Write a protein that binds this ligand. Structure first.
Ligand SMILES: Nc1nc2c(ncn2[C@@H]2O[C@H](COP(=O)(O)OP(=O)(O)OP(=O)(O)O)[C@@H](O)[C@H]2O)c(=O)[nH]1
Ligand SMILES: [Mg+2]
Ligand SMILES: [Mg+2]
Lengths: 99, 100, 198, 88, 99, 60, 170, 65, 90
RNA sequence: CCGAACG
RNA sequence: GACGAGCUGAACGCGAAUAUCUCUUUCGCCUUUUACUAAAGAGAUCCGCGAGUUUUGCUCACGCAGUCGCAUCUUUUUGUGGGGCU
């Protein structure tokens, strides 16, 4: 798979119930199982008019999580992965002169 | 084979391997069918008991138990496990066979 | 000497850095901190019946020591990992029991940390045995397929039941059935069955 | 070996659309489809149910939650339709 | 509870360091021998000599080897080996003995 | 590996397959001396050290 | 310790029948009877026909049929009781049960290998005690230095040389 | 399967659409069909006798012991 | 074994620890997993049930069908599995 | 064990 | 995601074969020295030996090639849908 290009790369997951999971990639199974390090659940609360959609999505911290593909719907990238000497000598020598 | 005459086991030479002879020379005592070696270096009766003689295969089979002043020796009579192989003779019997 | 030589004090010469294994340091550090993935086992048998070599095969499958093996079959001797003291070595004998816990694999893929304690099997070293046996709650009795039961086997078996242990049978050296004795497969079944029955 | 995932895995570098099971819309380029119908897309924009579009440099979508594919109008279908009966 | 062996140190040997000038390290050797050999037993008599107690041939053999090279480095003369004699009754005494 | 023909000992087995009691005295003495040198060349082969070669006939 | 060899007293009953005690505690501390208790032990056992005891190695000898006889031969020289010679099921080796005393085990594995050319290999473990033959306190036999005594004089000279080493008179 | 460790034990088996049946186990399959003795519907308070439940008809099982 | 992907053997080596189980229904299950299946059916003990309404309940044992389960929460201690380290670039 | 040179 | 026989060079290293020499000592031959004996040690040498690319000398040989940038019944990719309450 090309998600071998994607282990250690931080990623976000959508569930069928539309809950959000953000963690970093460790190991993947054929069944679309995933291993999320440093995972946290962003669950979308309904948008109460007068507030930004971006500023109150409920974050829970799950820790290390593993994801069963059956309810795995969509995956995206979130960010980057988090963080002869040779036979030469030089010696001082005058230059010889012919006279 | 007729020149080899027959095979050796690691078995047979329990006091005939080199180690036998190292223990031999280090104690100035030599196997009965074993060779000579001149010295490397150069006891109360009422209180000490003899029920059987300290023999030379004895001091040769445990050099530090049975000998005062043993030195320069490698190890002693340690035995290889017994070998339950006997020459199958005739090529007609099965490869795998019970020995009587 | 008047100037005493500064000698390598050749007692039992080990290696100068923790070796390469198929697991990490912190992986074993993990598997230690929870009792449900650790098994303590002493390994006992008669003299020579395969104990040291089985421990060595474990080492060979769970570590990184191949060029060691090349040095072994080039020099003409088979490896003895737990027989470390180069005087216990040169007698082809385990002299004093030595411990080792290896992170080994299950069929489930769940790695268990197994504390195997390679013991001497020669009778006059039973002392070592009891130590390891009061150390470990389980025991592996390695009885060699060829010669059946011997003294130290069943004496360590009494040691094993007296200290209330999980006794586990390892029929070692099955190839001596095939190659030395050449007993057919059926008589091999009879002999193996008879050894576990004994 | 079904005919149709046999057809779908040759959609490599196809700039196509996708409908999800719950009603999300995705327009992007197929970098790969595999035997499980799971697709990894490039040059993507995903627009959720009632949501603003958000663009993705790359995207992964499970074969099972796929509702359907919208293929290019420029498609030589009968090119990719041959060989589907061929076992390799 | 201490180790309750199956075996007993039934064999005994005498030990006299060839040089008495090194009987301390000798016993320290013996002492350090009493370090590594669970069945090793060091016993001093009215005779004053240190008798050492082992299972038999190989155990006393290798304890004498490690005493010679591992701990003391003092080479020691060991007499002929001899074992421990218990003292039993045949049938009960015919008179009651007082003290 | 192939050996040098004179490296190969051909009477070594006669020191392993051990003496039958049928050995005249001279043959027993000679067997004993041969088996002594045998166990000795076995044992104390002092591996000297690897100072590096000349190869006379290659140079010549 | 005990009186015969100051080696452990075994298989001995000490029955208290009488103690005429002084009534007040200071007449009957440890310093008054601890020697006296040891002296009553010494005396009460001494006149009870006291006998000496050996350890007996449980000797198990695996051996081919080729060597059975020499097994018996050397242990017969060393007073060992062979218990049986069980033919091993499935192999051509016979296990051999024997009881050979630990005294008589001195150099035994060696000589057993030596008169068998080594096809046999035996093991010995401590098995039990049993009584040294003869009369251990005896004087009716005045014995040889440097030569072994017969069966009839063992128990005698054995505790004798015991005492002589341990620092006691005969 | 670990259902083997449950043999002949009183259980609480939850099923699809929030249903509980509680009965001493009698046996299971590879498809995790379950046969129960003296099973009780915890909704309507009815002991429903010996039952078989389907595999995907098993959300969870708890052991009251 | 041959054929089996890494994360389920992760689940297996998680044996003997206390973990968390989220199923597709949304309730949380914290307990000591005894052992689990190829099909992610698992048995925990010392079970804390966190229902959809915050309900906290005590269950002695739990057998969880895997295709009922959404994800697992596992100690980062065990994220030191030999797969994790071995695959790792360093 | 065991033989050559020299003085 | 992939290919050697023979020689001389490699620079690193001592399965089973072992002879000679030097030195420091003891011992024995014993008039002396060589030439020796046999013990202890400490040192050399010889005759050989294995792997890495260096190619010299093929007299062999090659490129749509063996390999490329798990495939529908209760346990997995053929999901239980629909609505609506704070
Ligand atoms: N035929 C055969 N010989 C084996 C086998 N395993 C080990 N051996 C041999 O048996 C010898 C003795 O086994 P060891 O490895 O010493 O095992 P041990 O029984 O612990 O021996 P001690 O160390 O004396 O206790 C080894 O040197 C091997 O040659 C086996 O499977 N078959
Ligand atoms: Mg002159
Ligand atoms: Mg002159």
């Amino acid at each position: 798979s090309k998600l071998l290009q994607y282990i250690n790369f931080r990623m976000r997951v959508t569930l069928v119930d539309s809950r959000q999971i953000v963690g970093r990639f460790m190991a993947f199974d054929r069944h679309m199982n995933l291993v999320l390090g440093d995972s946290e659940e962003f669950r979308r609360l309904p948008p109460k008019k007068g507030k930004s959609e971006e500023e109150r999505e409920e974050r829970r911290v799950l820790g290390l999580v593993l994801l069963r593909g059956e309810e795995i719907v969509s995956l995206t990238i979130e960010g980057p992965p988090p963080n002869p000497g040779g036979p030469g000598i030089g010696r001082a020598v005058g230059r010889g002169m012919p006279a | 084979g007729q020149l080899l005459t027959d095979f050796p086991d690691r078995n047979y030479f329990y006091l005939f391997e080199p180690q036998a002879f190292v223990t031999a020379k280090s104690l100035n005592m030599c196997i009965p069918g074993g060779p000579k070696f001149e010295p490397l270096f150069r006891n109360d009766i009422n209180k000490l008991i003899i029920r059987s003689p300290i023999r030379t295969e004895y001091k040769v089979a445990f050099p530090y138990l049975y000998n005062n002043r043993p030195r320069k020796v490698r190890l002693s009579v340690y035995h290889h496990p017994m070998s339950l192989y006997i020459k199958t003779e005739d090529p007609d019997l099965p490869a795998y066979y019970y020995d009587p | 000497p008047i100037v005493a030589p500064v000698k390598v004090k050749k007692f039992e010469t080990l290696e100068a850095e923790p070796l390469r294994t198929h697991y990490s340091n912190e992986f074993l550090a993990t598997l230690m901190a929870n009792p449900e993935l650790v098994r303590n086992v002493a390994v006992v048998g008669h003299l020579h019946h395969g104990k040291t070599t089985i421990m060595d095969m474990f080492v060979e499958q769970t570590h990184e020591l191949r060029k060691m093996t090349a040095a072994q079959q080039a020099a003409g001797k088979q490896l003895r990992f737990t027989d470390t003291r180069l005087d216990e070595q040169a007698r082809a004998m385990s002299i004093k029991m030595m411990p080792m816990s290896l992170v080994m694999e299950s069929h489930s893929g769940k790695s268990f940390l197994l504390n195997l304690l390679d013991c001497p099997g020669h009778v006059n070293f039973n002392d070592e045995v009891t130590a390891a046996m009061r150390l470990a709650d389980g025991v592996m009795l390695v009885v060699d397929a060829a010669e059946g039961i011997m003294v130290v086997t069943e004496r360590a078996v009494r040691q094993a039941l007296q200290e209330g242990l999980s006794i586990t049978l390892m029929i070692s050296k099955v190839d001596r059935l095939i190659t030395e004795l050449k007993l057919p497969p059926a008589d091999a079944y009879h002999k193996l069955r008879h050894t576990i029955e004994e | 070996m079904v005919k149709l995932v046999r057809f779908l895995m040759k959609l490599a570098n196809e700039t196509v659309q996708i409908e999800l099971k719950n009603g999300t819309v995705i327009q992007g380029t197929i970098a790969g489809v595999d035997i499980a119908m799971n697709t990894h897309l490039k040059a993507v924009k995903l627009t959720a149910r009632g949501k603003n579009p958000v663009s993705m440099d790359h995207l992964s979508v499970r074969g099972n939650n796929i509702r359907y594919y919208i293929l290019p109008d420029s498609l030589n279908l009968d090119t990719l339709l041959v060989d589907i009966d061929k076992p390799k | 509870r201490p180790l309750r062996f199956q075996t007993r140190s039934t064999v005994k040997i005498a030990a006299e360091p060839l040089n008495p000038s090194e009987l301390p390290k000798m016993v320290e050797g013996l002492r350090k021998v009493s370090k590594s050999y669970p069945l090793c037993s060091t016993r001093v008599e009215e005779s004053g000599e240190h008798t050492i107690f082992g299972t038999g041939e190989m155990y006393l053999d290798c304890l004498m080897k490690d005493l010679r090279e591992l701990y003391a480095e003092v080479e020691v003369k060991v007499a002929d080996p001899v074992v421990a004699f218990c003292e039993t009754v045949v049938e009960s005494s015919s008179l009651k003995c007082f003290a | 590996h192939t050996r040098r023909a004179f490296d190969v000992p051909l009477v070594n087995c006669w020191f392993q397959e051990h003496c039958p009691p049928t050995y005249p005295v001279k043959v027993r003495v000679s067997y004993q001396k041969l088996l002594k040198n045998y166990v000795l060349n076995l044992l104390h082969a002092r591996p000297p050290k690897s100072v590096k070669k000349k190869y006379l006939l290659r140079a010549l | 310790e005990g009186p015969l060899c100051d080696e452990p007293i075994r298989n001995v009953k000490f029955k208290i029948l009488d103690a005429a005690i002084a009534p007040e505690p200071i007449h009957r501390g440890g310093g008054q009877i601890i020697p006296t208790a040891r002296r009553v032990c010494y005396s009460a056992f001494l006149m009870a026909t006291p006998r000496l005891m050996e350890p007996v190695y449980y000797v198990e000898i695996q051996t081919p049929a080729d060597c059975i006889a020499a097994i018996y031969n050397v242990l017969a020289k060393r007073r060992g009781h062979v218990t049986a010679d069980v033919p091993k099921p499935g192999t051509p080796i016979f296990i051999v049960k024997a009881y050979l005393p630990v005294v008589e085990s001195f150099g035994f594995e060696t000589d057993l290998r030596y008169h068998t050319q080594g096809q046999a290999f035996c093991q010995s473990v401590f098995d039990h005690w049993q009584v040294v033959p003869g009369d251990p306190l005896d004087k009716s036999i005045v014995l040889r230095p440097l030569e072994p005594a017969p069966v009839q004089a063992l128990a005698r000279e054995f505790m004798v040389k015991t005492r002589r080493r341990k620092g006691m008179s005969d | 399967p670990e259902l083997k460790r449950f043999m002949d034990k009183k259980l609480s088996i939850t099923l699809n659409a929030n249903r509980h049946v509680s009965g001493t186990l009698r046996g299971f399959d590879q498809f995790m069909n379950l046969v129960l003795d003296a099973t009780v519907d915890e909704k309507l308070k009815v002991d429903i006798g010996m039952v078989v439940i389907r595999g995907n008809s098993i959300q969870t099982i708890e052991a009251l012991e | 074994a041959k054929g089996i992907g890494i994360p389920v053997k992760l689940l297996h080596e998680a044996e003997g620890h206390v973990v968390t189980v989220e199923l597709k229904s949304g309730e949380m299950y914290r307990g000591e997993l005894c052992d689990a299946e190829d099909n992610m059916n698992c048995q925990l003990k010392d079970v804390t049930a966190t229902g959809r309404d915050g309900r906290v309940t005590q269950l002695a044992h739990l057998f969880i069908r895997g295709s009922r389960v959404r994800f697992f929460i596992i100690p980062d201690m065990l994220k030191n599995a030999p797969m994790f380290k071995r695959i790792d670039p360093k």
